[PDB]
Amino acid sequence: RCSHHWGYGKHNGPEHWHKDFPIANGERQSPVDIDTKAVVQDPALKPLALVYGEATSRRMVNNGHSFNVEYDDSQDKAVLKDGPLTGTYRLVQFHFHWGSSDDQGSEHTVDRKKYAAELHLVHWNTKYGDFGTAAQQPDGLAVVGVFLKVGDANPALQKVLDALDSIKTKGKSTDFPNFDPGSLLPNVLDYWTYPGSLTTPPLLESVTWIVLKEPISVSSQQMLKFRTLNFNAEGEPELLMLANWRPAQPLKNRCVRGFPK
Ligand SMILES: [Zn+2]
């Protein structure tokens, strides 16, 4: 399996995380609020390389604090190059973070504005040989973050939202083959990038954040689904996974870059 203690409740909420996970007050935490007014540009930035071509989806798994679509990362099937990055990151999995209401639920916020859910595409630098290892380096992981705003039903975000029923509780897994990750990527790829961390315990500060300025859409009828999901596991006391996002943290002495500007 894989247990789970922390969470998004009154006692286990992101508010207390700092306890078992001290770094939650680290000098590079995520998410953060991108203050467009202060965004900066770095001539050394390039356009996002999203080589999701050969990508091959495996299964979808409810890890008890979200649901995941896992890809085969033993080869460069699909990677992420250039952008603010240097090296090659292998996409290992993607997930989302919704809220208890359409009006909030995103970890990153642009000018304090929040969206329903926020998609997270997780890649790990190959120079470290494996996800685990890479996950402990200042530049081991890189996450491409796409927003989700209430609008029209998403054909793409449905093949996903479908299978959720077959993995409603913690631990369940569905064979979700032949799904294309790019299909959840907008068509415009301007992005914001800063040095952050994972937005969940262990909260390791080894993530490069590429947050795409252009949000993709989702029909409110779809957001209701994300909530159908269960926090507990087949047999525990049914607990709905309504909220599961970390509020924005201090940027500290960091600076969010922008591309093109
Ligand atoms: Zn995440």
Side-chain angles (χ1 to χ4, degrees):
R1 306 117 269 75
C2 265
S3 62
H4 196 309
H5 183 60
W6 54 274
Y8 311 89
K10 172 189 176 181
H11 312 296
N12 52 320
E15 291 314 297
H16 306 299
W17 288 1
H18 60 58
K19 284 182 179 64
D20 305 316
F21 308 95
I23 199 158
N25 294 115
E27 303 307 308
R28 286 180 297 250
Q29 291 287 293
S30 288
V32 301
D33 192 65
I34 315 158
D35 181 9
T36 357
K37 293 179 168 292
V39 173
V40 177
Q41 52 267 172
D42 161 58
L45 279 187
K46 295 168 154 280
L48 268 168
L50 290 162
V51 170
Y52 288 13
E54 237 67 74
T56 60
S57 333
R58 288 299 196 70
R59 308 172 62 68
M60 190 192 267
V61 63
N62 178 310
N63 57 45
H65 56 282
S66 189
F67 71 86
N68 282 182
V69 181
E70 297 164 349
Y71 287 81
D72 163 62
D73 72 319
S74 71
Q75 318 170 70
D76 281 13
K77 297 258 184 175
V79 286
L80 165 75
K81 300 180 67 175
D82 292 296
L85 325 170
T86 282
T88 299
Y89 297 67
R90 276 186 197 177
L91 167 69
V92 60
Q93 65 89 43
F94 77 65
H95 58 274
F96 313 78
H97 295 231
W98 55 103
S100 51
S101 37
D102 286 30
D103 64 296
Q104 30 105 294
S106 73
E107 320 222 312
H108 294 80
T109 54
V110 199
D111 294 307
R112 319 228 166 169
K113 178 190 194 296
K114 309 178 184 186
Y115 304 68
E118 194 185 308
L119 162 65
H120 278 161
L121 291 147
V122 170
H123 326 62
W124 51 271
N125 199 318
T126 49
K127 65 172 175 167
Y128 297 122
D130 62 276
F131 188 62
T133 302
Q136 312 304 159
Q137 327 287 145
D139 77 334
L141 319 178
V143 186
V144 172
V146 205
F147 284 120
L148 284 77
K149 67 172 293 189
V150 280
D152 320 69
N154 191 296
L157 187 49
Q158 282 290 171
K159 208 276 198 181
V160 175
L161 255 40
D162 284 311
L164 282 191
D165 301 297
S166 42
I167 54 106
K168 196 56 66 66
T169 42
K170 181 175 181 179
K172 302 194 66 180
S173 49
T174 286
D175 187 277
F176 197 67
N178 305 304
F179 183 93
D180 176 52
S183 78
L184 288 160
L185 292 170
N187 258 289
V188 207
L189 307 188
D190 290 47
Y191 70 67
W192 289 289
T193 181
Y194 67 104
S197 78
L198 308 169
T199 58
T200 49
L203 301 187
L204 294 157
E205 303 181 323
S206 52
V207 182
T208 291
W209 282 92
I210 309 145
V211 334
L212 315 175
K213 307 188 178 188
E214 312 290 353
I216 67 179
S217 194
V218 66
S219 65
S220 176
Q221 304 100 57
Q222 298 179 300
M223 290 310 281
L224 301 179
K225 239 301 185 306
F226 277 109
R227 284 96 167 211
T228 59
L229 282 171
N230 221 276
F231 264 131
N232 288 176
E234 250 264 78
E236 297 294 326
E238 196 217 65
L239 197 237
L240 287 185
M241 202 190 298
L242 273 37
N244 70 164
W245 53 269
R246 191 186 189 187
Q249 313 281 300
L251 181 64
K252 260 62 174 299
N253 293 300
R254 296 177 298 193
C255 65
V256 186
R257 293 184 173 62
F259 186 95
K261 49 172 60 176

